[PDB]
Design a protein around this ligand. Structure first.
Ligand SMILES: [Mg+2]
Ligand SMILES: [Mg+2]
Lengths: 429, 429
């Protein structure tokens, strides 16, 4: 039911909010001005001009806003009652998808997936193994299979003294942000696209249950482990992100010298052939302009194809029977796969990227060990100094799992500069 | 006439474009993906978390989008025919103002106004004085009173082989971007707000004349020096920029330790008193959260006040008789002035900001002198090396003024990193 999916409800609301009577734009406005989003300006994208996480978020938001606007147009033309009595507009869908896409990278720890694996391995085989017997199975699982999507949900909606609900985003935006509406256990029960990872920690189970019950998400789990169907706009958000990750990593790889210019045309002829102006392409004198020209065309065709795919399986998506992505139903699957493999071989496996990941591991391991050692023995002078350096903000009487997840969130959201400086101080440099 | 002001015309168009038959959102989308806008991620805001030019542009765009949406609502309710037959929406106004505000900092040289003065002084008393007799009075004036607004217009609309019209933005966006629709001469003929500076160089006179004739801007000059009235949405763009420059420089100054916390409340009580929740403010435990809370409130009230002021003088603004800014008609003028003066005394006059400006002067002077010396004698080996290092892109048979303005644009749009590296290479470091 689309009426419940486009909920304007926020945390702490008592009276129901109706479309015909704050707005989805306000979510984007709040995310833009938020400190965690601003902090993305000092966070890199594990590549050797090259995009930072802030620009990637910006570009993803721009693709998601286009996808959502077209999808809202088509749904409003398919469900007249959504605008006749409920008063919804395609700009609403665009705003929801753009706000969800803008914050999709707000909780990811530095150094890419290597940082996530470092946080996981710290609690699996490192100093964090001591907490295994003091936590429940799902809590420990969250600790060992730490992902930045659950951390991003935590950042977007975590209460603090004087700020309940965090950014207080609308429930539609929160639902679109959740790509994996399931708990930390069981680990990958099936081949469904939404079961690859989890989207919320144990400290957010009640809040996401409230969000799902407000949005009317279908309960797909018959056991005691909660799991819901994906929000239909989460498909658009993820498709936008994949389109950017594919076409823009290739642009960045080509412009940085890691990928020769020939592969650009070689893997973009199929994508851009239907709309390329050959005279304009040949008239361009710089490689950067040509690759930008190709990137714009490819993004446009992929956006249109994703909209067509979404409207092809709307009923299946709303029922929860869709087990793959919108980009997986692409006619350009071979070319997309070839581009992804070439990017993996030339960028992600480059020395510079490997070197950086090896440093992240040592920095994150050191910081996590220092924070945990301070947590266990908060009486020594060195531990008091560590607490002052890394957690001067506040202190409270919380549980062990809450403290550990707070440590993980604080370490994940540090800027590369702040993390490196703290690691050097702790290492006496 | 508002119908002509909301023009969808772009460079090279032959058939007229009508609202009821590409869209103002496309301008924002293009600016986001443009290389010059991306380059703002490596450009600082001459302050010692602290905003870069990209985040300032982002925040300004967000304020301008709010202002434009409210102003469009009120104009559509005041002119029913703008939506009944022409089919315009308030989202159009919001998109135009947001696109204009996003690119307002795209042509400014580094090191703030110190860089602009360095470029001016290079041609006034430096090595550039040799070109005074080889150029017209207005051309030389443009060289010596170089501003980043004209350079931003150049960046947004300058033709290149394979790219005619640059980003090919809509004419409404270009009109809203132009804060000073006048030539380089005469220099400040009156006290009008639009006559403080100029908005386009001599190489863009024909293009901006075409833009003004398409938008129906009123010719305010009876002499041979062209000058037009401000576009009504340029007032909103400038008001948004001033609101951010005032409230956010104060936030940055407070958070950086240059401004104590007391002045925050002292100068924000009047602005935020009508909408502040005292319980929420006192419950916050960190200074950053409190100042963010105050900044959001102040931005909201200033936005509403600016909308009210704009609708107060709509007829005067459309006739061209308005000689001041929207922020100049504020009831909070004393508090705004006090905040600006405190920011000037504590941030802009800080050592760190002074030191940086003294370095900009030497870097920009060195780079401009090297480029000019390469231009005059393009036969020596050293000059060929300089041309390869600083201008490898392309070469053409252009006039002296075109070459000099191209040199100025290229130097102004270099990233701080690229500029510093080139200056060190030239200095043999
Ligand atoms: Mg992404
Ligand atoms: Mg500004």
């Amino acid at each position: 039911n689309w009426e419940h999916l486009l909920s304007l409800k926020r945390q702490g609301d008592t009276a129901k909010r109706l479309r015909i009577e704050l707005g989805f734009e306000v979510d984007y406005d709040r995310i833009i001005f938020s400190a965690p989003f601003r902090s993305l300006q000092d966070k890199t994208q594990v590549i050797p001009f090259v995009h930072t996480r802030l620009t990637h978020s910006l570009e993803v938001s721009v693709v998601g806003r286009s996808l959502g606007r077209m999808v809202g147009k088509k749904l409003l033309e398919k469900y007249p009652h959504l605008e006749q009595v409920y008063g919804y507009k395609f700009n609403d869908f665009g705003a929801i998808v753009a706000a969800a896409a803008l914050a999709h990278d707000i909780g990811n720890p530095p150094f890419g997936h290597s940082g996530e694996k470092a946080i996981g391995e710290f609690f699996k085989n490192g100093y964090g193994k001591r907490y295994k017997d003091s936590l429940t199975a799902k809590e420990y699982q969250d600790l060992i299979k730490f992902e930045g999507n659950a951390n991003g949900f935590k950042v977007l909606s975590q209460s603090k003294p004087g700020a309940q609900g965090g950014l207080r985003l609308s429930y539609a935006t929160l639902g679109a942000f959740m790509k994996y509406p399931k708990e930390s256990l069981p680990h990958k029960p099936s081949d469904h696209i939404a079961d690859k990872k989890y989207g919320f920690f144990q400290s957010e189970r009640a809040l996401f249950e409230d969000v799902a019950q407000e949005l009317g998400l279908l309960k797909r789990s018959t056991t005691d482990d909660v799991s819901w169907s994906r929000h239909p706009l989460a498909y658009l958000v993820e498709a936008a992100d994949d389109i950017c990750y594919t076409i823009i990593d290739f642009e960045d790889g080509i412009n940085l010298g890691l990928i020769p210019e020939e592969y650009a045309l070689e893997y973009m002829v199929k994508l851009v052939g239907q709309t390329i102006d050959r005279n304009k392409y040949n008239a361009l004198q710089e490689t950067s302009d040509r690759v930008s020209y190709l990137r714009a065309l490819a993004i446009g065709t992929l956006i249109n194809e994703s909209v067509d795919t979404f409207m092809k399986y709307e009923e299946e998506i709303l029922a929860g029977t869709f087990d793959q992505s919108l980009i997986d139903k692409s006619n350009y699957q071979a070319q997309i796969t070839d581009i992804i493999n070439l990017s993996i071989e030339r960028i992600y496996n480059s020395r510079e990227v490997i070197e950086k990941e090896i440093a992240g591991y040592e920095i994150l391991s050191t910081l996590l060990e220092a924070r945990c050692r301070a947590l266990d023995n908060n009486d020594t002078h060195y531990n008091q100094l560590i607490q002052q350096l890394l957690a001067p903000n506040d202190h409270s009487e919380k549980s062990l799992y809450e403290n550990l997840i707070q440590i993980c969130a604080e370490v994940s959201t540090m800027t590369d500069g702040k993390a490196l400086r703290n690691y050097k101080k702790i290492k006496g440099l």
